[PDB]
């Protein structure tokens, strides 16, 4: 057991270099002090937020089958203060991605919703013919089939939005002139597994509206396709930087956590710590310390002196 005193600016760099060397184990000089008391909490908290957010995006990356090879850059683990802004930049990217997917899902609903109308043009809606055998009978139960039903069958039906998958669709829906019974049918249609919300017209104008719908559908799909394309390009590009980032962030966290396990002096911006280290490797440690503090602009001697124990 030996004790080292050096300036805190030099200390950040030195700890980083020693962590890269990996031959020294630091002891906690303040065992009765919690993380808020150690005052690395803001740095750790930021690291933890960065980590979780990175992992969040990582899940999307992995689902997207991005190679994330993690073969370089990361090993150098630089730890400038500007990394905090880089952390924020990460948060922005994943947040953008989160908005895009949310938008896509809404777009998907609209796509499907318009697609159903496209198909329709009561109503020739989208039904799996789950309860239609009973829908008709329920109608007969409310009134004796006062109006004929419209029948249709969809070849290669569209993927039902609630289902999330593609099922054959078949429609048999009744229209009524009576208001009491129309309201009754409304209630049945709401209760039964049927697609009902068509806004029919018989005028040529409605066929023209249906054409406008097709146009809008195409525009929606175009925008969707571009959104997804951007998403994927961004995800893979981020996957490259994320493999590097993961380890960079982990290293920073480890460094700050190690520095918490220390006793910060009160009167000077200098840090004293006791560490265990191999005797034979002490020279190697001092050379690492020299390089670390040399990177630090203050070039504090950073002398590690053996204690008796």
């Amino acid at each position: 057991l030996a004790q080292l005193f050096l300036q805190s600016e030099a200390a950040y760099c030195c700890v980083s270099e020693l962590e890269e060397l990996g031959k020294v184990q630091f002891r906690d000089l303040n065992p009765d002090v919690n993380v808020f008391q150690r005052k690395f909490v803001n740095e750790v908290r930021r690291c933890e937020e960065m980590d979780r957010k990175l992992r969040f995006v990582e899940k999307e990356i992995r689902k997207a089958n991005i190679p994330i090879m993690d073969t370089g850059e990361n090993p150098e683990v630089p730890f400038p203060r500007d990394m905090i802004d880089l952390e924020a930049n990460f948060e922005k990217i994943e947040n953008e991605l989160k908005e895009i997917n949310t938008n896509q899902e809404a777009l998907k609903r609209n796509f499907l919703e318009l697609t159903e109308l496209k198909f329709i043009l009561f109503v020739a809606g989208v039904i799996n013919r789950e309860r239609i055998p009973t829908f008709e009978r329920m109608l007969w139960r409310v009134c004796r089939g006062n109006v004929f039903l419209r029948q249709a069958e969809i070849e290669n039906p569209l993927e039902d939005p609630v289902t999330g998958d593609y099922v054959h669709k078949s429609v048999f829906i009744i229209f009524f002139q009576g208001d009491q019974l129309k309201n009754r049918v409304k209630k049945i249609c709401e209760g039964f597994r049927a697609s009902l919300y068509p806004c029919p017209e018989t005028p040529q104008e409605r066929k023209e509206m249906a054409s406008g719908v097709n146009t809008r559908i195409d525009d929606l799909q175009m925008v969707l396709n571009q959104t997804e394309d951007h998403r994927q390009r961004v995800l893979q590009a981020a996957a490259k930087n994320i493999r590097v980032w993961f380890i960079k962030v982990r290293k920073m966290k480890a460094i700050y956590h190690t520095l918490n396990l220390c006793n910060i002096d009160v009167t000077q911006k200098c840090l004293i710590a006791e560490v265990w280290c191999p005797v034979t490797d002490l020279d190697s440690i001092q050379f690492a310390l020299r390089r670390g503090t040399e990177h630090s602009g203050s070039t504090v001697p950073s002398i590690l002196n053996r204690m008796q124990t």
Partner: protein, 360 residues
């Protein structure tokens, strides 16, 4: 007592007889009793009004059915012309329910046929509503009278330990107009009657010896009166209690006993006087409730028949009086006879024809 009410599409005139007379095809091979159902020919507008009316009638039906059965129970509680084991129902149209239903007629007097159904329904609904409120109020007032009368009977019930003394104590039982003396009544169990007679004379200082006598007796104790000096009453009643005799908290009071006697006599007479008008009131209300009840069912028949078969409104409606254990056969017959019209529109209620039950 359940009757079945059904209606067929009536496409052919044979339906009039197929539901009654066609022994080859009719109910239990013409063994169930059937009769013609008299229906008014009323105006219908569009199908949605009919739909409304159907819903309304179903609700009115349930309401009145409840009301007429409730009032029937009210009369059962009265115990006049209707009991729970005999006389299960009251007369309707001045005839028995079996007679009424069997020869049921439409009451055009209440529901003119020149009116729209909406108005007919509203009129019936109003009638049965008024009847309901009239009899509810009357029954409540009567029940309150019955309550008070029973309360008085109970007050004047029990043994001498607790029974009111209104019918027991006479002026000649108390020592009245004394300056020093008061007469107390104490209940001594019969087993200790002689002990009381022997002991009462020595229970307290300054009591009048040999004054004790017996006012009343029952299966457990004797009620005896003793005259004593006012100030010894505390010692008297204390020591009497010590010897296991119970003193009643009673003093002679002519006005309270007379008031109790007349109040009971009055309430009993009032019970009789209301009973008189009670049975006439309730029986008339029943008659009208039952007539309206079946009228409602007839309208439910009209509405469903038109709603299912369209117009013109010519349907063959018939009543059955089911025979015991033949329900299955009748349903099988009716199904085979009429299933071809609906095949699936009509278990718990859906049959391929208009069908209602009458619960009597």
């Amino acid at each position: 007592t359940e009757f079945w009410l059904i209606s067929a599409p009536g496409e052919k005139t044979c339906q009039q007889t197929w539901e009654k007379l066609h022994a080859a095809t009719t109910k239990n091979n013409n063994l169930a009793v059937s009769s013609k159902f008299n229906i008014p020919d009323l105006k219908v507008g569009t199908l949605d009004v009919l739909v409304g009316l159907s819903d309304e009638l179903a609700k009115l039906d349930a309401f009145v059915e409840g009301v007429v059965k409730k009032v029937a129970q009210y009369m059962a509680d009265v115990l006049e012309d209707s009991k729970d084991k005999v006389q299960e129902n009251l007369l309707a149209s001045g005839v028995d329910l079996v007679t009424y239903i069997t020869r049921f007629q439409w009451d055009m007097a209440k529901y003119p046929i020149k009116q729209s159904l909406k108005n007919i329904s509203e009129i019936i609904a109003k009638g049965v509503t008024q009847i309901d409120n009239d009899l509810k109020s009357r029954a409540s007032a009567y029940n309150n009278l019955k309550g008070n009368l029973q309360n008085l009977e109970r007050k004047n019930a029990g043994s001498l330990l607790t029974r009111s003394l209104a019918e027991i104590v006479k002026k000649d039982d108390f020592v009245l107009d004394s300056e020093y003396l008061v007469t107390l009544l104490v209940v001594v169990p019969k087993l200790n009657h002689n002990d009381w007679i022997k002991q009462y004379e020595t229970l307290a200082e300054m009591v009048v010896p040999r004054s004790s006598n017996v006012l009343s007796e029952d299966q457990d104790s004797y009620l005896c009166n003793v005259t004593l000096f006012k100030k010894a009453v505390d010692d008297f009643r204390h020591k009497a209690r010590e010897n296991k005799f119970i003193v009643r908290d009673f003093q002679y009071n002519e006005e309270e006993m007379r008031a109790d006697k007349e109040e009971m006599n009055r309430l009993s007479t009032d019970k009789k006087k209301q009973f008189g008008p009670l049975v006439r009131w309730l029986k008339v209300n029943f008659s009208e409730a039952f007539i309206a009840w079946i009228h409602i069912k007839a309208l439910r028949v009209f509405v469903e028949s038109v709603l299912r078969y369209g117009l013109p409104v010519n349907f063959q409606a018939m009543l059955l009086q089911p025979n015991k254990k033949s329900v299955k056969k009748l349903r099988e017959v009716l199904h085979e006879l009429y299933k071809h019209l609906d095949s699936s529109a009509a278990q718990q209620e859906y049959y391929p024809y208009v069908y209602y039950k009458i619960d009597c």
